[PDB]
Amino acid sequence: AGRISAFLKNAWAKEPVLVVSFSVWGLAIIMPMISPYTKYASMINKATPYNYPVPVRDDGNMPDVPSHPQDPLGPSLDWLKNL
Amino acid sequence: YPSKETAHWKPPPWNDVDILKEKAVTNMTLNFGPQHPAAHGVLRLVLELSG
Amino acid sequence: MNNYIFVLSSLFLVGCLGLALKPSPIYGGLGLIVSGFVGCLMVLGFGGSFLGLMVFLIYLGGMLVVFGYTTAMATEEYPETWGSNWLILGFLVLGVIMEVFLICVLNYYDEVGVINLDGLGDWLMYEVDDVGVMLEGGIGVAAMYSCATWMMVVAGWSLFAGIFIIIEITRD
Amino acid sequence: PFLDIQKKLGISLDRHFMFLSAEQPYKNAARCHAFEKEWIECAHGIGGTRAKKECKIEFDDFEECLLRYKTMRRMHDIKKQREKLMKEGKYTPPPHHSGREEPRP
Amino acid sequence: RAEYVVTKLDDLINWARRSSLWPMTFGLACCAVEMMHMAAPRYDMDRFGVVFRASPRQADVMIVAGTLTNKMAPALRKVYDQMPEPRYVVSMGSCANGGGYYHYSYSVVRGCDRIVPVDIYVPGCPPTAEALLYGILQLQRKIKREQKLKIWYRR
Amino acid sequence: MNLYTVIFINILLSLTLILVAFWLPQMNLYSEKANPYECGFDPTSSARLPFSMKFFLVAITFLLFDLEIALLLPLPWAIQTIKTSTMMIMAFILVTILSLGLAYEWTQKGLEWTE
Amino acid sequence: MWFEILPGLAIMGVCLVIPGVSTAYIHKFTNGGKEKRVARVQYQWYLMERDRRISGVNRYYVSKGLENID
Amino acid sequence: MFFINILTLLVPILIAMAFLTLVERKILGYMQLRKGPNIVGPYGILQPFADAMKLFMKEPMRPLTTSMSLFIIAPTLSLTLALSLWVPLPMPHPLINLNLGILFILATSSLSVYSILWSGWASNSKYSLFGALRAVAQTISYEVTMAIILLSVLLMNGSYSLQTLITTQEHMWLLLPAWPMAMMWFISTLAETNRAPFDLTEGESELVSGFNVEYAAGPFALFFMAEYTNIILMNALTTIIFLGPLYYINLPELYSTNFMMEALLLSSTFLWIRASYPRFRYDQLMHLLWKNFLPLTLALCMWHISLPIFTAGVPPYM
Amino acid sequence: MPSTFFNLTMAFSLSLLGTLMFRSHLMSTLLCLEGMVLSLFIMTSVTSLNSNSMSSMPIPITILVFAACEAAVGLALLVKVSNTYGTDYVQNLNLLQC
């Protein structure tokens, strides 16, 4: 649109602070929704170990959890290592 | 039921507005005396100021 | 070094007594600044520093705007500090004597155990996790962003509605 | 009165921080978590007058944990007797209580 | 010897007061035009350590530079009185010295020494900025000669 | 204890400086010297009259924005949360409504110093 | 000329260098050749208190190694 | 040893601010086609000492219409807050290590504003009242802007500490990631220090001396010391936050030297600004901040909220 | 802790007495209100820190926000009172009795 472009160009010439602020507001809204790294922040904060990992009893019916830290089982952090 | 302790009262106005004008704002009087740097050495600029 | 918090609490009581005794609002704001600093020190001594620093900053801004307003409109030719009336000073020292009398009475009456002279400074911090990370104050105030979003949104709406409220009150 | 739109809609606006033993930020406790847990588990389902009557043991334990009046009185009695014995000369404190102790990790 | 120590201490305080002279931002006329020409980059009074201060509470010497009118004289006396105690007066130009060109006027105080005690008189109409700087340095020497601690010690 | 000692040392230093300033020099006090300044004339008023500031609405808005600051300040610990999506949304909403309040006040000429 | 300001600039320079360098050296001297060992959290404070109890001279900075174990 | 550390922090800072007065006079003179003081010292280096001795040997001149308690309390308060504000700065190891160092800085700055306000109201004069009200307006504007700026920058950082700022700026400055915040923070430090262009509290031309117009020598020197100490401190805080000096674990002397060089450069930048620009009006300062910096810093605070989330670059807690 | 809590409760009581006993100054009444607010903030913060109720630590921030909102409204009303009369006197605003 001609009127919209002329208004935006006049605003960019005369008040180039509100234009920058609205553009930065829109960029800060849009950018988390299109970035591929958004899930990684939550996963990093999940993987950060602020508490002791309380061990569970060995009933012999869970094969998913490991038996020792030097095991292939468990949530390995190779994604963070290679990130 | 007016008594001696409430005989001096008045009914409220119909529109809840009454004249209570004071006009006692008392704008501050400050003199740019003949020592101010802004004054040109010799000037007593008496200023009525509202702040 | 045990009765440090008690000394701070007594100073807070004195500052609130002066604020109650109602000087000119310049000195009222002074007394509230002193009381805010003292309460900040009390919170810092009891634990996390974020709450004390927050209330200190907030009351600094508040008493600054209060100072501007009492200069603008809530002023008089002779703003009484405390000595315009001898009754105010006599009542301040009377309240101080009553404070000393009541704490001595509650130390003598040690059955309930609200105030004890020998046991002062012994029960300030009850139990703390000696080994541990992320257990200080401010983590909960951060948890307002994630665990109490209702608290966050009612505070935000209070400030927003307050902007509209103050504009409509002072619209004139 | 007390509307229950939070129970009707199933949401929890302010219900997860009603008491001490409820959803601390990282994994922490609130210094009386076990006592408050026992008191609430006692009082649930029988609430009101019955909870006031036959959960008095759990409530007294929780109130003692939170306020520590009896521990304060016991410690004050011990220290008062100790000071009386110090005045009467019949007590000498051990090295670990008064002065140099052997520190262990 | 107490006399030697007192003399050296008095020399120290005189050096301080003469190296830090703060005149007041106060002039009246063409003589004050020459005063700010003494403030100009050529004869740098700030190089000499002489720097104007607007308030009389932060001033040390009043440079009476201009014609002291009758209407002006209470203001000049009040401003001089409002200075702190070690204060000096440099009269500058013929008007402040003895009235000058307006000596027989109905509205001119015949010399500012009728109003304030004058330490140094600087002649001219106007005195050059060099001449005013000469008067300032002569004032510095005059307060270098002062012996307050020694007079106190022999008092 | 260390910070307490440094605070007390600075306070004692300032007190020592002002005590030196008050007991060192020679005093000569009279009425015209200690009168209020007022640019070389007697003051008309008492300098305690009402002043009538012109930015009172801006001051009240400053109070509200200072409490919005107090709300916004735990963000460095808030970004360490495990959810981070509700955290990001809540921070966006808070900053947006603060900006909307500022924009509404600007449009309604609140920060314009009404004389 | 313009280089006449350099004496005052150099005096300010040495007066700004002195506090940080002196603080680091005083920290080293007081802590025995190591840094201050700041404790932001209770875990770090517990480590300091445990070190103070382990050393036996009531000084946390006296580090004890494998010579204590036979 | 700790009192020796206090001395080696306090005494060099006081000598640094006295020679900051000397450097200011000489830099302003050489930008004004003249010299600075070169007679009192060998190169003018004894001029601040002569000024200090003259101010402390003039009488303090207590006035009649004056609340004496606040009139005496305010300058001592200003000086002790300036030194207390100097306490927690790391170069690279602080005298007092605080977790919430920036919050401590903000609280102490607001209390210094209170010192100025109490002096202005206690010295019962109209020009002092004018200076106090101008201080109120100025601190409203820069307080809200400074709080937002520090929030966004320390969101880019981790905690509210300053050794964490050193470790953050170990590889690269914070000026390159957030330079608009650095510009607005520089302007806000000017407003906090009450320096030119927008001094407006000791306005020599609009007012006579502002809030110092009734303060004679002594406590006036205390106010001047507090102001110039705050100048050096705000420049030091700016170079710690934004222009991160090189840090190496083996030797901190190059960190101290780099911090010194950048702090000297920013102090000379303050004197440069004073020589260059005229004064704002104090309503124009409020309009400028609340209409240009505050919307832009709100938007940039939102951008720095979003940035570590969408880049996964959330800083560590420690 | 119980001695400090008793002192804080007495400080709140003193600020309440200040609020109830007027002395010619609406601004001083608002000051007493904010003293009550500060006492409540310190009480809540000390209680939460003593009980380790980090989940209830947002409560002092909430009361501070709402207290500053009410202080804002009170300052606006004081501005309107001063515009009406020019003195800000609680005895001067009395004309609603009839």
Ligand SMILES: COC1=C(OC)C(=O)C(C/C=C(\C)CC/C=C(\C)CC/C=C(\C)CC/C=C(/C)CC/C=C(/C)CC/C=C(\C)CC/C=C(\C)CC/C=C(\C)CC/C=C(/C)CCC=C(C)C)=C(C)C1=O
């Ligand atoms: C046509 O019409 C007319 C006019 O209209 C245009 C007029 O105008 C007019 C009036 C005309 C005049 C009054 C003429 C006067 C001249 C001027 C107005 C122009 C001259 C220029 C200026 C006034 C501007 C000056 C500009 C500058 C940049 C100069 C800098 C000045 C400053 C005040 C800032 C610098 C600071 C200082 C000088 C002092 C700093 C030092 C201290 C306070 C020292 C403090 C330090 C300490 C206490 C440290 C102590 C601590 C320690 C540890 C030290 C240790 C000590 C030991 C002993 C060991 C007249 C009559 C007139 O007809």
Ligand SMILES: CCCCCCCCCCCCCCCCCC(=O)OC[C@H](COP(=O)([O-])OCC[N+](C)(C)C)OC(=O)CCCCCCCCCCCCCCCCC
């Ligand atoms: C600490 C590090 C160094 C900092 C700089 C220090 C050296 C320089 C010092 C210069 C002199 C400063 C002295 C004081 C000056 C005071 C005046 C002043 O500055 O006023 C402020 C002026 C105000 O200008 P104004 O007031 O003339 O504006 C006119 C406005 N009306 C008409 C309403 C009055 O400028 C600003 O407010 C600008 C602030 C900084 C903006 C930075 C924006 C950066 C770019 C953002 C992103 C752009 C892209 C958008 C997205 C694209 C996506 C692809």
Ligand SMILES: CCCCCCCCCCCCCCCCCC(=O)OC[C@H](COP(=O)(O)OCCN)OC(=O)CCCCCCCCCCCCCCCCC
């Ligand atoms: C002229 C009168 C002047 C009166 C006003 C004085 C103002 C002083 C300077 C401004 C102070 C602003 C508030 C600062 C509070 C302390 C800031 C802080 O964070 O303190 C907490 C800190 C330890 O906390 P943290 O960093 O978490 O450390 C834990 C692991 N490292 O550290 C601590 O826990 C230490 C706690 C005590 C620190 C403050 C001590 C103040 C002492 C009283 C001063 C005033 C006395 C009255 C007047 C005397 C006579 C004039």
Ligand code: SF4
């Ligand atoms: S002496 Fe001459 S130059 Fe000086 S003020 Fe008088 S007329 Fe002007």
